[PDB]
Amino acid sequence: FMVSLPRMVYPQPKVLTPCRKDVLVVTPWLAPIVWEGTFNIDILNEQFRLQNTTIGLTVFAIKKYVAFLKLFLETAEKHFMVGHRVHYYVFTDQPAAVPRVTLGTGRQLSVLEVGDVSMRRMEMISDFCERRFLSEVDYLVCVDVDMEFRDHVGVEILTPLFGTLHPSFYGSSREAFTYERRPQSQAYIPKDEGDFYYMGAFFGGSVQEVQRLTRACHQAMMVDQANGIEAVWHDESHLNKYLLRHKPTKVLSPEYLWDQQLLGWPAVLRKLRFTAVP
C-alpha cells in the first residue's frame, strides 16, 4: 500500500517538449533509460522515502583491491542514496584491512569474510546471502570496488531489475558487442541478437530479482565449467545472456559507469556519477 504524495510545486512536464532529444530514454520494452534531465529527483525521493526503502550495496574487495575501499565508501557516503537507508555489505578476504569509514545516520556496514574465484560473486549473492538480504533490504545494488562516486546516484535507479550500459559499447552495433559467441557456452548470443552490452560492474534490482539473476548466472557458469568452457568475459557474459532473455525494467546510462581517463567527457554525458579510479 502506497500513501499519497504530499503537495509539491515543480515545473510542469510538457508532452510536446522532450526532456532529452539527443538520446534514447525508453527501451523498446518500455523500460526507462536513466539519463540526467529525465527524472525529478524530488518526486522520486518522496515516493521511495514514503516506502521507507532500504538499499543494500554489495562490493567485493579481495587481495590488493582492499586498498580501494576507503575512497569507494567515503564517496558513497557523499553521493549514494543520501537520505535513504543504506546497508553496505563488504565481502573480503581481509576483514582487518577494511577502513574505518564514518557513516551518515541510517546507514550501516557489515564485513563478510570470504574463503571458483570467477563464480564467487554470483554464488555469494544467490546462495550464501539469500536469506540475509531478503530479511534486511528491499533492493540490492552490485558494484565493483575500484571505483568512486563523483555525483548523485540515487533512487532513480531502483526498479525490479536493472543493468547498466557499458561505457565502451553504448554507440556500438550489436555484432561488435563482446558477447560470448561460442554455441558451446550457456552465455552464447548469436550475432543477430542483443539489445545492449551491459557491464558486470553495476547491476541490481529487488532482492528477489537479483537473487533470480545471480542464481541463473551461477547455474549457467557451473554448466560451462562441467563442459570445459569459460565465457569470454566471465560473469559479465552470463549477465548479458540473462538480461537478453529477461529484460531489465530500467537501464542505466553510462553516466552510472564511466572511465574518464579512457573515454573523456562526451557531450551526451551531463554528469559523470560513478567512475573508474585511474
From Swiss-Prot:
Glycosylation sites noted in the Swiss-Prot or TrEMBL record: 52
- Please provide, in alphabetical order, the Gene Ontology terms of the cellular component aspect for this entry: extracellular region; Golgi apparatus; Golgi cisterna membrane; Golgi membrane; vesicle
List ligand-binding residues for UDP-N-acetyl-alpha-D-galactosamine: 60-62, 65, 144-146
Residues binding Mn(2+), per UniProt: 144, 146
According to its UniProt record, in which tissues is this protein expressed? Expressed at high levels in testis. Also expressed in pancreas, uterus and lung and salivary gland.
Any keyword Cytoplasm?
Answer: no
Q: Where is the active site?
A: 236
What is the reaction catalyzed? an alpha-L-fucosyl-(1->2)-beta-D-galactosyl derivative + UDP-N-acetyl-alpha-D-galactosamine = an N-acetyl-alpha-D-galactosaminyl-(1->3)-[alpha-L-fucosyl-(1->2)]-beta-D-galactosyl derivative + UDP + H(+); an alpha-L-fucosyl-(1->2)-beta-D-galactosyl derivative + UDP-alpha-D-galactose = an alpha-D-galactosyl-(1->3)-[alpha-L-fucosyl-(1->2)]-beta-D-galactosyl derivative + UDP + H(+)
Posttranslational modification, per the record? The soluble form derives from the membrane form by proteolytic processing.
Alphabetized, the UniProt keywords read:
Blood group antigen, Glycoprotein, Glycosyltransferase, Golgi apparatus, Manganese, Membrane, Metal-binding, Secreted, Signal-anchor, Transferase, Transmembrane, Transmembrane helix
Impact of changing residue 167 to A on the protein?
In allele B(A)
Q: Which residues bind an alpha-L-fucosyl-(1->2)-beta-D-galactosyl derivative?
A: 166, 178, 236, 259
> According to the UniProt record, what happens if one changes residue 147 to T/V?
Alters substrate specificity so that both UDP-N-acetyl-D-galactosamine and UDP-galactose are utilized
Which terms in the Gene Ontology molecular function aspect does this entry carry? antigen binding; fucosylgalactoside 3-alpha-galactosyltransferase activity; glycoprotein-fucosylgalactoside alpha-N-acetylgalactosaminyltransferase activity; manganese ion binding; nucleotide binding
What result follows from mutating residue 131 to W?
Answer: In allele Aw07
The pathway this protein participates in, as annotated, is: Protein modification; protein glycosylation
Q: What is its EC number?
A: 2.4.1.40, 2.4.1.37
Per UniProt, subcellular location reads as:
Golgi apparatus, Golgi stack membrane; Secreted
**What is the UniProt domain comment for this protein?**
The conserved DXD motif is involved in cofactor binding. The manganese ion interacts with the beta-phosphate group of UDP and may also have a role in catalysis.
What the record says about family reads: Belongs to the glycosyltransferase 6 family.
Name the record gives this protein: Histo-blood group ABO system transferase
**Gene from which the chain derives:** ABO
